[PDB]
Amino acid sequence: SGFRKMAFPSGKVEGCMVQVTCGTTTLNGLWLDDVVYCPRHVICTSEDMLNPNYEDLLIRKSNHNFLVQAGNVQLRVIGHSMQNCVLKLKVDTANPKTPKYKFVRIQPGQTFSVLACYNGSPSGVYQCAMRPNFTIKGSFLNGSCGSVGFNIDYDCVSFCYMHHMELPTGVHAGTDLEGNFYGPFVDRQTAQAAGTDTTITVNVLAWLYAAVINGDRWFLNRFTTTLNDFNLVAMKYNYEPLTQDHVDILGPLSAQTGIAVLDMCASLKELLQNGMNGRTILGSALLEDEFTPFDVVRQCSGVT
Amino acid sequence: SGFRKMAFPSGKVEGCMVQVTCGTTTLNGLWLDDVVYCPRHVICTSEDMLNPNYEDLLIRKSNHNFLVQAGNVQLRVIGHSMQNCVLKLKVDTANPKTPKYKFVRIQPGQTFSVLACYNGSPSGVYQCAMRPNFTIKGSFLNGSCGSVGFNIDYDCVSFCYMHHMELPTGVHAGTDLEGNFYGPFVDRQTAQAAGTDTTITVNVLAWLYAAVINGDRWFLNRFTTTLNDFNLVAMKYNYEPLTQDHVDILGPLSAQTGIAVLDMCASLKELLQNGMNGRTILGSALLEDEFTPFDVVRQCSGVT
Numbered sequence: 001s002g003f004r005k006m007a008f009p010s011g012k013v014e015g016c017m018v019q020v021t022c023g024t025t026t027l028n029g030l031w032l033d034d035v036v037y038c039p040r041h042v043i044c045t046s047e048d049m050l051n052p053n054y055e056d057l058l059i060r061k062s063n064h065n066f067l068v069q070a071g072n073v074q075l076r077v078i079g080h081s082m083q084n085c086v087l088k089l090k091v092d093t094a095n096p097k098t099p100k101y102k103f104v105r106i107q108p109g110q111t112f113s114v115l116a117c118y119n120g121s122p123s124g125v126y127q128c129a130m131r132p133n134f135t136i137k138g139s140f141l142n143g144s145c146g147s148v149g150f151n152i153d154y155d156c157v158s159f160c161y162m163h164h165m166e167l168p169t170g171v172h173a174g175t176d177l178e179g180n181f182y183g184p185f186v187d188r189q190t191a192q193a194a195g196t197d198t199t200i201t202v203n204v205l206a207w208l209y210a211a212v213i214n215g216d217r218w219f220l221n222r223f224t225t226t227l228n229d230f231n232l233v234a235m236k237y238n239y240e241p242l243t244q245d246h247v248d249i250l251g252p253l254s255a256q257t258g259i260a261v262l263d264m265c266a267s268l269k270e271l272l273q274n275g276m277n278g279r280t281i282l283g284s285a286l287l288e289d290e291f292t293p294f295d296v297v298r299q300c301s302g303v304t
Numbered sequence: 305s306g307f308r309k310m311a312f313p314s315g316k317v318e319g320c321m322v323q324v325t326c327g328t329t330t331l332n333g334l335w336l337d338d339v340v341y342c343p344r345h346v347i348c349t350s351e352d353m354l355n356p357n358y359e360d361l362l363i364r365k366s367n368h369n370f371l372v373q374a375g376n377v378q379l380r381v382i383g384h385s386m387q388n389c390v391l392k393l394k395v396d397t398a399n400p401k402t403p404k405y406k407f408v409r410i411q412p413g414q415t416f417s418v419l420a421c422y423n424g425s426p427s428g429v430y431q432c433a434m435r436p437n438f439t440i441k442g443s444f445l446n447g448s449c450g451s452v453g454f455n456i457d458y459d460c461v462s463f464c465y466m467h468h469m470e471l472p473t474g475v476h477a478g479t480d481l482e483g484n485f486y487g488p489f490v491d492r493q494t495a496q497a498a499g500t501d502t503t504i505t506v507n508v509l510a511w512l513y514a515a516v517i518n519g520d521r522w523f524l525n526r527f528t529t530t531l532n533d534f535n536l537v538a539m540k541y542n543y544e545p546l547t548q549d550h551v552d553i554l555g556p557l558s559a560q561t562g563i564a565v566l567d568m569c570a571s572l573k574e575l576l577q578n579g580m581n582g583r584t585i586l587g588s589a590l591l592e593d594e595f596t597p598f599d600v601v602r603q604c605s606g607v608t
């Protein structure tokens with residue numbers, strides 16, 4: 001019993017974190033096999049950040065200008081290339097602690113763990129979600145760029161995010177491990193605003209199922225709804241539209257609890273219209289949307 | 305910018321988790337040097353749990369009745385002893401991945417990370433706090449016993465908790481690594497009720513300082529208070545009494561923000577009396593009390 005915001009064990013990713021320094025800029029790198037992946041803005045000064053031409057700035061850099069340190073030992077850089085917004089630094093040593101891994105580009109609403117690092121050293125791990133506007137709400141200070149987001153399936157780490165930026169509003173932006181930003185963001189110190197940060201409806205429903213499984217049932221109402229009626233209310237409350245794909249994904253949670261997906265939708269609709277009335281659900285006074293249906297199944301079943 | 309519920313990187317603790325089986329019961333163990341620590345109720349059947357006499361049950365057990373597996377390899381048990389509510393299993397091999405470590409008994413209000421495990425395998429990591437009634441609100445399923453709580457200071461892991469029990473209300477109880485339970489709980493399947501779960505006042509204030517540092521300032525009021533006036537309101541709201549020791553501990557956060565501790569107390573007093581009014585602080589609709597002042601300093605400064 002009990003339901004917590006839980007991150008994946010971070011050991012497999014801690015064994016991959018390195019420090020990358022180019023001139024006077026230092027950030028984090030991800031060492032997998034004989035390649036170190038890092039934000040391409042490691043080559044920039046704070047002045048260059050205002051309007052960088054990365055291809056031009058990279059002409060002035062050779063292999064020996066990238067200092068990669070793993071623990072307290074220096075790695076030899078034998079090649080470098082820019083792929084989208086990441087630099088790939090070929091090193092002469094394969095990372096002995098390289099886990100089984102994949103690079104995945106996640107969809108909005110998907111959750112992942114972030115191992116926040118500074119100078120190639122892990123400081124903490126937390127769980128977050130790719131917002132529908134393609135930002136994440138992380139906890140990142142100067143030097144955190146290059147910190148990665150990931151999911152784990154038994155022994156394989158699927159890297160899905162690398163941190164690159166903080167928008168002027170304090171929210172965060174980054175890329176997949178191929179260097180492609182999530183959303184319309186660019187690695188430039190220019191005013192970039194995020195779109196509407198809607199609530200991830202399918203995740204709120206999954207978390208309502210977790211609440212029922214853990215005994216918080218006060219919010220269960222005597223109503224049902226349809227996808228179209230529910231979505232009219234969801235639109236009004238800045239909730240993402242619910243599709244039949246989302247209903248399908250909640251099927252195992254509906255089966256475990258005996259609560260039809262549309263009945264849970266009607267309970268959510270009443271919570272939106274009436275509010276919490278000073279009550280809590282799983283120790284929260286707001287509806288939590290950073291647990292996917294897969295997260296709820298995993299946590300409630302004890303997947304290791 | 306941004307403030308998250310963050311756990312310590314778990315790698316150092318993942319390298320210590322083992323599976324301990326005695327007869328038909330399997331739980332987790334913590335392998336440090338040549339000793340494996342685990343809940344003494346690994347020797348019990350579900351029937352024994354109702355009214356166990358551990359000393360008597362242990363007479364029927366020899367070294368070879370404790371099966372310890374680290375990864376997919378069996379460890380040889382060459383000694384066993386009961387210390388309070390934990391068993392210490394001496395093994396013939398020192399754990400090669402033993403980090404620098406200490407065993408600490410924490411005070412209520414102190415936070416720590418839990419690496420939830422099943423069959424000696426890590427499933428997730430989350431941050432929690434020792435409640436003032438000496439329970440924790442974790443996420444633990446059957447077989448999670450033996451999972452540990454810890455804090456890290458650079459390279460030294462201070463183990464503070466081992467999971468032993470779930471109370472009939474869904475809250476959790478356990479011991480320090482010397483086997484002494486936090487609070488009045490016993491390792492027996494008998495109705496045990498928790499006392500008042502008060503709010504950790506000093507932690508709420510630390511989190512209000514984190515909110516100010518991250519730009520959420522709407523709640524800052526034009527008032528001040530005294531410790532005695534504040535405590536009269538805190539008692540009414542089931543908040544822990546604030547002492548001058550707590551004020552001292554908030555000193556660095558008071559200095560960083562320029563907000564006197566007693567002014568923050570008056571802002572908290574107004575939040576308690578007026579409520580949030582549908583507003584949020586750091587994405588929360590309730591006042592968060594599972595960040596200590598040390599956690600706020602660490603996260604806001606980037607300690608690795």
Ligand SMILES: *[C@]1(O)C(=O)N(CC(=O)O)c2ccc(CC)cc21
Nearest residue numbers: 140141142143144145164165166
């Ligand atoms: C990136 O290098 C970094 O560490 N940060 C700080 C952060 O808080 O995220 C940051 C902020 C902005 C930019 C512009 C692309 C880069 C970085």
Ligand SMILES: *[C@]1(O)C(=O)N(CC(=O)O)c2ccc(CC)cc21
Nearest residue numbers: 444445446447448449468469470
């Ligand atoms: C302990 O062996 C365990 O794993 N659990 C399950 C839990 O959800 O915490 C448990 C519950 C009760 C007791 C009685 C002491 C032991 C354990």
